[PDB]
C-alpha cells in the first residue's frame, strides 16, 4: 500500500548519458535522467519506460507498447476445428497452407527455391461457404501467434485512433514472430477511397493508407503472414487487391 | 564584479515568478475589466494592473496575464496570423512590372 505508481512514457532522442527525452504518453515531453542502475544501452529511442511521478527520473524500461485490444484480438479462442471438419475445400485448404504455414515452419526451403514468400492473401466468396470457418481451423491447428480481427471494432471514434491501433497490432505481430493476422470483413475499411466525405471517409481512408504502408513495402514484413476475408471483394480498394 | 553578481541575484529573484499564461482580447469590457481569450481553456474577464493604459488594449492584442488572479501584465507584439494565407492569401507578391516583358 505504501508504494506509489509511476507514470509511463516513451524515450525520445538521447542528449547525454545522464539526460534523456521522454514523451509521457499522452502528456508532454519531459527532460529526465536515468536513475542509477538501468543499462543505458536498453534505453533505445522509442522504448517504453516508467518514471517517478515526483522527480520524473526513469527507473525501469518495459516490454514494448500497450493496447489490450490487441491482447483480446490475439487470445480469441476459435475452438478446435480440424481441416477435416471443413468439407469440399481441399484445393483451397491446401493452397492456404502453402502461404500461411510452410513459410514460417520451413523458411529455409524457399531460400533454395529463391522465391520470397507471399505475406498476405485474401479469401473471397458468397456468404456461407466457410471462409471464417477456414480461418478458425487455421488458428486452432497451427502453432503460432494468431490475431483475429473484426474490421469494424478496429475503427474507433477518437481522432486518429484506428490507424494507431493498426500500427500497434502490426507492431505486436512483429514483436511476436511468427504471427498470423486475420482480418474478417476487410471490406469494412477496405472500401474504395472516396474523393470527399465526412470525418468517416477521412479517417477510414486514413486507416486504410496506414494499413497499406504497414504491409505494402519499405518495412518488408518478416514473418507477418496475413489473412483476410470478405463477402464483397469488389468494393475493396485496388491498392489492397494489388498482388 | 559586484555589478555582475548583483545582476545574477536579480536574475535568480526573477526566475521564481511563474509563466503568467498568454491571452488575447476581443473586447475592452470596462476601464478595469478586460475580457481575454486564453489558449487553450476558455474566455475570461480580467482586470488590468496598475501599468498598461487601458486605451492600449485592442482586439487581438495578444497580451500576457499574471499567473494568479490572472490579471493583465503587458501587450506583447501582435500575432503572425498564418491561417489560409498560403493558397488564397499572399502578403507581398514577388512579381513586379519589370519582371514582365513582351
Amino acid at each position: 500500500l505504501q508504494s506509489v505508481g509511476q507514470i509511463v512514457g516513451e524515450v525520445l532522442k538521447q542528449l547525454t548519458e545522464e539526460k534523456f527525452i521522454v514523451k509521457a504518453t499522452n502528456g508532454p515531453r519531459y527532460v529526465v535522467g536515468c536513475r542509477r542502475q538501468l543499462d543505458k544501452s536498453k534505453l533505445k529511442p522509442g522504448t517504453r519506460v516508467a518514471l517517478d511521478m515526483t522527480t520524473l527520473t526513469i527507473m525501469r524500461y518495459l516490454p514494448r507498447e500497450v493496447d489490450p485490444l490487441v491482447y483480446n484480438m490475439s487470445h480469441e479462442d476459435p475452438g478446435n476445428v480440424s481441416y477435416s471438419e471443413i468439407g469440399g475445400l481441399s484445393e483451397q485448404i491446401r493452397e492456404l497452407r502453402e502461404v500461411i504455414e510452410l513459410p514460417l515452419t520451413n523458411p529455409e526451403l524457399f531460400q533454395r527455391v529463391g522465391i520470397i514468400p507471399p505475406k498476405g492473401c485474401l479469401l473471397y466468396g458468397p456468404p456461407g461457404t466457410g471462409k471464417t470457418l477456414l480461418a478458425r481451423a487455421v488458428a486452432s491447428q497451427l502453432d503460432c501467434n494468431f490475431l483475429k480481427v473484426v474490421s469494424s471494432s478496429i475503427v474507433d471514434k477518437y481522432i486518429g485512433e484506428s490507424a494507431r491501433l493498426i500500427r500497434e497490432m502490426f507492431n505486436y505481430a512483429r514483436d511476436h514472430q511468427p504471427c498470423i493476422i486475420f482480418m474478417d470483413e476487410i471490406d469494412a475499411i477496405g472500401g474504395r477511397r472516396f474523393s470527399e466525405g465526412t470525418s468517416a471517409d477521412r479517417e477510414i481512408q486514413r486507416t486504410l493508407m496506414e494499413l497499406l504502408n504497414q504491409m505494402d513495402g519499405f518495412d518488408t514484413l518478416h514473418r507477418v503472414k496475413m489473412i483476410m476475408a470478405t463477402n464483397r471483394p469488389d468494393t475493396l480498394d485496388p491498392a489492397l487487391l494489388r498482388p | 564584479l559586484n555589478a555582475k553578481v548583483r545582476l545574477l541575484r536579480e536574475e535568480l529573484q526573477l526566475l521564481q515568478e511563474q509563466g503568467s499564461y498568454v491571452g488575447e482580447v476581443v473586447r475592452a469590457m470596462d476601464k478595469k475589466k478586460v475580457l481575454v481569450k486564453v489558449h487553450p481553456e476558455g474566455k475570461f474577464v480580467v482586470d488590468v494592473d496598475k501599468n498598461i493604459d487601458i486605451n492600449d488594449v485592442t482586439p487581438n492584442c495578444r497580451v500576457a496575464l499574471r499567473n494568479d488572479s490572472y490579471t493583465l501584465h503587458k501587450i506583447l507584439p501582435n500575432k503572425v496570423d498564418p491561417l489560409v494565407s498560403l493558397m488564397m492569401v499572399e502578403k507581398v507578391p514577388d512579381s513586379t512590372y519589370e519582371m514582365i516583358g513582351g
Binding site: - | M99, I100, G101, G102
Partner: protein, 101 residues
C-alpha cells in the same frame, strides 16, 4: 460582361518575335552565356508559341545543362531546347487537321 460586374476586355495575344525575346531575357539574367549567344535568332524559331513555353525553352535548356553536368548554356543548347519543347505544344495538332476537316 454585364453592368456592375466587369468593365473591359483585356486581351492576351501570343508574344511577338521581339516580345518572345524579352521573355527569354527575363530568365536570361541567371543563365550564363557563350562568347556570342544571339537570342534574336533563337527567338524567331517558335512562331505563335505562348509565354510559359518561351520560359519552357529556357526551362528545357535547364536540364540540358545537366545533360553535360557543367556550365553549358550554349547557343546550340536552345536549338534542341526548342526541339523537345515544341512537340508538347504539338503532335495531335498534325492529326487535328486530318481529324476535324
Amino acid at each position: 460582361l454585364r453592368p456592375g460586374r466587369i468593365d473591359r476586355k483585356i486581351e492576351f495575344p501570343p508574344p511577338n518575335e521581339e516580345a518572345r525575346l524579352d521573355i527569354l531575357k527575363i530568365h536570361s539574367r541567371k543563365m550564363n552565356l557563350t562568347r556570342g549567344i544571339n537570342l534574336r535568332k533563337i527567338a524567331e524559331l517558335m512562331p505563335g508559341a505562348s509565354g510559359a513555353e518561351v520560359k519552357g525553352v529556357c526551362t528545357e535548356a535547364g536540364m540540358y545543362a545537366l545533360r553535360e553536368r557543367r556550365v553549358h548554356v550554349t547557343q546550340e543548347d536552345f536549338e534542341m531546347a526548342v526541339a523537345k519543347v515544341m512537340q508538347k505544344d504539338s503532335e495531335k495538332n498534325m492529326s487535328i487537321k486530318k481529324l476535324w476537316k
